[PDB]
Design a protein around this ligand. Structure first.
Ligand code: K
Ligand code: K
Length: 227
């Protein structure tokens, strides 16, 4: 298993610059791309940029275009952040994408950047142990209507994990209690037999076929279990 380690975070004044590093423990022919995903404290996930294994493909979110630059060096991937703003304050993760599975197949630990001065989901959901809970994801023709859906689970203070890829497929280690589906421009995550460990945030995800710099992540759903 490849291990990813982010570094470079710290305190910076607005307008300043900072370079983050994503280090991979070893090369892998399965991993073809490396993403950066950030999360402001208490907010949702936001995809930042991606670079292919050979550096020839690079894409950025519109919220960082022109200010951020992704690059790599032979086992390191760099994110050069210029003209930093308070909105850029977030934990920055890097995540590799393999030739199968989902957009973000494994993740690092995160590095915090502090700058000193659309897929809609229900904000919250709940259930009792053993209950069946469904989480909706409402998109458009350009994203869900045109591309596969992913689902990601995030426990408090930890990096998210891939739950569902290719609309309805589970990676290894995901129980069959989780299932996904997609119809038209909407998608849904279903959790049968809700367990206490399922209390987490859940994000749907789908790439946009028109203007891909818009965003990939859903708004996120906080699921609480009433014991
Ligand atoms: K590689
Ligand atoms: K993948």
């Amino acid at each position: 298993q490849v291990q990813l380690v982010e570094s470079g975070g710290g305190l910076v004044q607005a307008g300043g610059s900072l370079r983050l590093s994503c280090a991979a423990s070893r090369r892998s022919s399965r991993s073809w791309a490396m993403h950066w995903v950030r999360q402001a404290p208490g907010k949702g996930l936001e995809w930042v940029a991606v670079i292919s294994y050979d550096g020839r493909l690079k894409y950025y979110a519109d919220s960082v275009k022109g200010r951020f630059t992704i690059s790599r060096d032979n086992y390191l991937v760099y994110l050069q952040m210029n003209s930093l703003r308070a909105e850029d304050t977030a934990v920055y993760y890097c995540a590799a994408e393999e030739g199968d599975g989902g957009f973000f197949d494994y993740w690092g630990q995160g590095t915090l950047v502090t700058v000193s001065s659309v897929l809609t989901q229900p904000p919250s959901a709940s259930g009792t142990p053993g209950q069946r809970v469904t989480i909706s994801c409402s998109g458009s023709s350009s994203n869900i209507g045109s591309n596969y859906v992913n689902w990601y689970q995030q426990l408090p203070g930890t990096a998210p994990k891939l739950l569902i890829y290719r609309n309805n497929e589970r990676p290894s280690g995901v129980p069959d209690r989780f299932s996904g589906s997609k119809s038209g421009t909407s998608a849904s995550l279903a959790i049968s037999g809700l367990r206490s460990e399922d209390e987490a945030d859940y994000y749907c995800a789908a790439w946009d076929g028109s203007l891909s710099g818009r965003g990939v992540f859903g708004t996120g759903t906080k699921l609480t279990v009433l014991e």
